[PDB]
């Protein structure tokens, strides 16, 4: 019977003489009209915006730290070479801005040198994430943001065909250039490759070998956070899958970083963490499409100057259903970003990792994505802040977050009483 | 998984109750704290907030006069009530931000002469 239940469940009855008052309901969905602009079309204020932030910083970061460590060498095909030396520039090396690739011999695979092949998908997933972080983010709304990215890598040594025609796609080693296009998304992102080569004795060459310098240039790049959550996830996967051999320089007194040798898929906490967060960042992005195609804006009333019925008149309701599980998944999916990475809740080596190197930075706060020579066992990410940021907008979203849950309720309600 | 309000009864216009939440360390760990209430023939209420860092924030309908606090050392959160009104007679109820699904019982605080 249901007096016997609008006693002990009192806020029941509130929420059915809420649902068939259409002045409620579009009090309700006007909340999730305002609760929409907050999530997808704010940045400092929007939860969801700052854990797609956090995702992509714990995967730079993640790199920051141990990318100067990390063994690579070889020839193009992921060949062993007997003399290769490729630098990549704008990298976080030992003490330096760039990162050296001069191990040879040693055939490139797991638990050895990454092969020069991974590097460069590597080394270009990098080079984007750096320049869009630099830039700032666009809110999660907009997607026809592009960038435009420049990156250098130089080959010397006997036999080294890191930069040859056949690695490259250039015409001609000296001078030449090539332009080739694909599409990220469904856009159109222009390469334009250029090779340069620059001989021992030319004059202002202080390394005293020669060396072939490539440029890329990208442009039209996208810097939706879809896009960019792809490159987070490329950098962290393909780190995870070549599994490389590290060996850190440690610090007297400093943190320590345990194991000082060893393979970088190793990090198993750290890189499932990781990956973790890109694909609950990725699932929360996701959410923005259902918003966008069940707009919430149309008032709703009894047609034929009738009084509303609850019953008949609510075929909106399964809209603003997804409409407002939509914000909500959005809204948990970004606390539980947080929640993975916060080292709060964290325990033994993964807190330290955390707390002692990634959530750190050396350059000496300067703005997102610049790689320094003191770069390197550092986040640089802005990890902490952007951590304190996710909660701050949570705490500031307490309003809305309850005001979702009603519209769902409602929402819910009408839905039941049309069957 | 647990949340435990408690502290609240009847007082008077002008008065002040501090009322507290036991809650469990899964909850509150690390997480943004908060308190809502629920008053006669309305749904439920955000109140104020609070970060791990101690940072609070306030609903329009009780800034100046309630103060949110945490005690991390023994996931313990507390509202500060003054100035009641009889406006702010409700059940009281502290959940983390974004609320978990299951609620405590709440604590009942009646304000009137």
């Known amino acids: 019977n249901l007096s016997k239940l609008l006693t002990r469940y009192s806020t029941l009855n509130t929420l059915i003489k809420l649902s068939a008052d259409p002045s409620a309901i579009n009090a309700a969905r006007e909340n999730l009209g305002a609760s929409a602009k907050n999530l997808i079309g704010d940045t400092k204020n929007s939860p969801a915006y700052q854990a797609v932030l956090l995702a992509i910083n714990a995967a730079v970061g993640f790199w920051n730290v141990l990318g100067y460590a990390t063994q690579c060498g070889g020839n193009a095909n992921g060949q062993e070479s007997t003399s290769s030396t490729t630098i990549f520039n704008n990298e976080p090396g030992y003490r330096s801005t760039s990162i050296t690739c001069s191990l040879n011999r040693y055939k490139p695979g797991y638990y050895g040198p990454m092969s020069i092949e991974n590097f460069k998908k590597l080394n270009e997933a990098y080079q984007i994430l750096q320049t869009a972080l630099n830039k700032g983010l666009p809110a999660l709304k907009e997607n026809n943001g592009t960038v435009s990215v420049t990156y250098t890598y130089t080959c010397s040594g006997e036999g080294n065909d890191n930069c040859s025609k056949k690695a490259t796609g250039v015409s001609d080693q000296n001078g030449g250039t090539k332009t080739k296009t694909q599409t990220i998304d469904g856009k159109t992102v222009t390469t334009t490759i250029s090779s340069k080569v620059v001989d021992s004795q030319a004059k202002g060459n202080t390394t005293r070998v020669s060396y072939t310098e490539i440029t890329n240039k990208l442009d039209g790049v996208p810097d939706s956070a879809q896009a960019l959550l792809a490159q987070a996830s490329t950098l962290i996967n393909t780190i995870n899958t070549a599994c490389p051999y590290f060996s850190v320089t440690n610090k007297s007194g400093g943190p320590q970083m345990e194991p000082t040798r060893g393979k970088l898929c190793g990090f198993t906490e750290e890189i499932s963490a990781i990956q973790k967060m890109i694909t609950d960042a990725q699932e929360l992005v996701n959410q923005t499409s259902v918003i966008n195609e069940h707009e919430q804006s149309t008032p709703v009333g009894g047609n034929n100057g009738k009084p509303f019925n609850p019953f008949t008149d609510a075929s909106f309701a399964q809209g603003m259903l997804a409409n407002a599980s939509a914000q909500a998944k959005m809204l948990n999916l970004a606390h539980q970003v947080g929640q993975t990475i916060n080292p709060d809740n964290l325990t033994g080596t993964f807190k330290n990792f955390v707390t002692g190197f990634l959530a750190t930075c050396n350059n000496k706060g300067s703005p997102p994505g610049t790689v320094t020579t003191q770069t390197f066992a550092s986040g640089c990410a802005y990890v902490e802040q952007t951590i304190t940021n996710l909660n701050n907008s949570i705490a500031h979203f307490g309003t809305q977050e309850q005001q979702i849950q009603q519209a769902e309720n409602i929402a819910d309600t009408l839905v039941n009483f049309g069957s | 998984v647990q949340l435990q309000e408690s502290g609240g009864g009847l007082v008077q216009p002008g008065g002040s109750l501090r009322l507290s939440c036991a809650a469990s360390?899964?909850?509150?760990?690390?997480?943004?704290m908060g308190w809502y209430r629920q008053a006669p023939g309305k749904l439920r209420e955000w109140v104020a907030a609070?970060?791990?860092?101690?940072?609070?924030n306030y609903a329009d309908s009780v800034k100046g006069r309630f103060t949110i606090s945490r005690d991390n050392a023994k996931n313990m959160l507390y509202l500060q009530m003054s100035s009641l009104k009889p406006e702010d007679t409700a059940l009281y109820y502290c959940?983390?931000?974004?609320?978990?699904?299951?609620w405590g019982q709440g604590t009942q605080v009646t304000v009137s002469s």
């Open positions: 360390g899964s909850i509150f760990s690390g997480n943004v």
């Open positions: 609070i970060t791990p860092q101690g940072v609070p």
């Open positions: 959940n983390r931000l974004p609320n978990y699904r299951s």
